């Protein structure tokens, strides 16, 4: 509606019998391949990402927001749990670190 | 006729169907991304999970009912053609 791409803002400019809108849009580029899974199975319970996707780079699993590559360690802060890990299809296995354990306060 | 004509259309039916097939293939394999720039492929179950979050239902609801959801979608698409043909 306001230009091709994810819309950020627009500036108007007068013309003799109409208007000229200068739409400013954000467009992604330089994409890359990754392997992913819908959930992680740890301790018999399934973990899902709060926001983003589980992205694997060949050997390690990470969480990353969907629209821009910024990998993070999978922790209890960015995932939520739901039931045992046998109903979801394509679940994979990996360690879900809890930041409270290493501190051991 | 007596001076009238019916000039033919620039896009033939075949080319319009080709455009439509292009849009369907794009939406099935890449979701929204192909409309905002470079088409990025994403598995169809995860794309539907994205959309479920979009309407405010957590995505685990989709992963636990994938079979049921697919069956309901197939039945609806099957009844569409019969409905269009029987409706006068
Ligand atoms: C962004 C990217 O690298 N996409 C690649 C594509 O170039 C390649 O043709 C295809 C087959 O291996 O795999 C994927
Ligand atoms: C194939 C590959 O690059 N795997 C990377 C590895 O190099 C890196 O050391 C590790 C931690 O960042 O994450 C993963
Ligand atoms: C894909 C895979 O390796 N799954 C296994 C699972 O069958 C097993 O019950 C669990 C126990 O360690 O470890 C993991």
């Amino acid at each position: 509606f306001c230009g091709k791409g994810y819309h950020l803002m627009s500036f108007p400019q007068s013309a003799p019998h109409g208007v000229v809108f200068l739409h400013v849009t954000y467009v992604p580029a330089q994409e890359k391949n990754f392997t992913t899974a819908p959930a992680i199975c740890h301790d018999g319970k399934a973990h899902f990402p709060r926001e983003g996707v589980f992205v694997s780079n060949g050997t390690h699993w990470f969480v990353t927001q969907r629209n821009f590559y910024e990998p993070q360690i999978i922790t209890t802060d960015n995932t939520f749990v739901s039931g045992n890990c046998d109903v979801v299809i394509g679940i994979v296995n990996n360690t879900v670190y809890d930041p409270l354990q290493p501190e051991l306060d | 006729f007596n001076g009238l004509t019916v000039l033919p259309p620039l896009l033939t039916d075949e080319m319009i169907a080709q455009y439509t097939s292009a849009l369907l293939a794009g939406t099935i394999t890449s979701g929204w991304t192909f409309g905002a720039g470079p088409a990025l492929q994403i598995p169809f179950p995860m794309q539907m999970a994205y959309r479920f979050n979009g309407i405010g239902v957590t995505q685990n609801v989709l992963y636990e009912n994938q079979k049921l959801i697919a069956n309901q979608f197939n039945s609806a698409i099957g009844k569409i053609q019969d409905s269009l043909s029987s409706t006068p």
Side-chain angles (χ1 to χ4, degrees), chain A residues 1-3 5-9 11-65 67-69 71-100 102 105, chain B residues 1-66 68-78 80-81 83-85 88:
Chain A
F1 187 64
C2 311
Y6 300 109
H7 179 241
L8 288 174
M9 65 196 169
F11 301 115
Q13 294 288 263
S14 175
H17 278 314
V19 196
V20 172
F21 293 106
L22 266 64
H23 303 307
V24 188
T25 55
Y26 166 98
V27 176
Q30 296 192 347
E31 45 266 9
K32 195 190 296 302
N33 285 328
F34 284 114
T35 301
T36 67
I40 303 294
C41 172
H42 187 240
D43 287 29
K45 65 200 82 178
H47 292 73
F48 302 82
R50 288 188 179 177
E51 297 182 354
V53 282
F54 289 125
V55 158
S56 85
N57 85 335
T59 50
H60 291 78
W61 287 88
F62 301 122
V63 195
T64 179
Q65 57 190 294
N67 294 347
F68 186 83
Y69 187 56
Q72 302 175 12
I73 301 296
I74 303 169
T75 65
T76 59
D77 293 350
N78 49 21
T79 61
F80 67 97
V81 176
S82 287
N84 67 305
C85 85
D86 81 331
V87 66
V88 67
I89 299 166
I91 193 150
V92 301
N93 293 320
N94 213 354
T95 77
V96 181
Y97 305 95
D98 198 308
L100 185 149
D105 187 63
Chain B
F1 278 97
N2 312 248
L4 320 142
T5 3
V6 191
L7 324 115
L10 171 59
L11 294 183
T12 178
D13 280 7
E14 314 310 344
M15 301 206 293
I16 293 173
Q18 199 165 11
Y19 272 130
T20 299
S21 279
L23 291 153
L24 284 156
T27 182
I28 283 164
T29 58
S30 61
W32 308 305
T33 65
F34 89 104
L40 315 173
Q41 74 272 16
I42 176 170
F44 194 78
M46 297 193 195
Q47 163 172 328
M48 188 149 280
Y50 278 16
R51 288 158 184 285
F52 263 58
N53 283 351
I55 61 163
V57 179
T58 55
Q59 49 179 325
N60 74 292
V61 176
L62 168 60
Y63 294 137
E64 291 165 25
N65 306 285
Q66 189 175 333
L68 176 62
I69 282 163
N71 285 9
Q72 287 183 4
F73 174 82
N74 296 346
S75 296
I77 294 284
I80 279 296
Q81 180 177 357
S83 43
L84 277 169
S85 168

